[PDB]
Amino acid sequence: NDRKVYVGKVVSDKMDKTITVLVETYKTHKLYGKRVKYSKKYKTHDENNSAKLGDIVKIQETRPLSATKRFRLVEIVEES
């Protein structure tokens, strides 16, 4: 099987082994049809916290870690 993967931006790295990833996507309005940008914040695990605020990273889901995290850091591609 396959676990879902998201690509977002690091908006918080103030906690150890944890970063906040902002995955912005698009949702159309049911009535008017205009596509509206909405964003969702994901809390992801990274044992070696090499991600710094401003990096676009690759996120994949996993089993529940802590009360909120359900994702792990797969790939870091930006430098900022």
Binding site: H29, L31, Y32, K34, V36
Partner: protein
């Protein structure tokens, strides 16, 4: 407006304020609370039976009754027909429908019902105004 203005502020329709509000409310004697019921009819007690002068364009002495319904609500109700047998402490059935002339009467007392007799000489239109089939 523009589409973006509509997305941010979706259109808001007007609310419909319904006539005969006292038929839309129930009571709970155990919890001493008012409920929402939407009743076709309500039953009450006549606390005052009298006559009301109508609006200015018209002129006729109209009979009415101050009725305290099953709720703790005191409304004024019309008495259709010619003759009525209602005094104080009379149990009546009250339906919707207001009287245009009479200001402050938004209900009608159902004739030919619980403790309310029909019209004595009515022969055509006996569904309304109570009274059974003659012979």
């Amino acid at each position: 407006p523009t589409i973006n203005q509509l997305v941010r502020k979706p259109r808001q329709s007007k609310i419909k304020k319904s006539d005969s509000p006292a038929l839309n409310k129930g009571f709970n004697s155990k919890k001493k609370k008012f409920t929402d019921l939407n009743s076709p009819q309500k039953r009450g007690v006549c606390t005052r039976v009298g006559t009301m002068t109508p609006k200015k364009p018209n002129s006729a002495l109209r009979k009415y009754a101050r009725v305290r319904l099953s709720n703790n609500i005191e409304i004024n109700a019309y008495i259709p027909g010619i003759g009525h047998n209602l005094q104080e402490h009379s149990v009546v059935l009250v339906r919707g429908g207001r009287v245009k002339d009479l200001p402050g009467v938004r209900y009608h007392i159902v004739r030919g019902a619980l403790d309310t007799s029909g019209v004595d000489g009515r022969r055509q239109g006996r569904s309304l105004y109570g009274t059974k089939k003659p012979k």
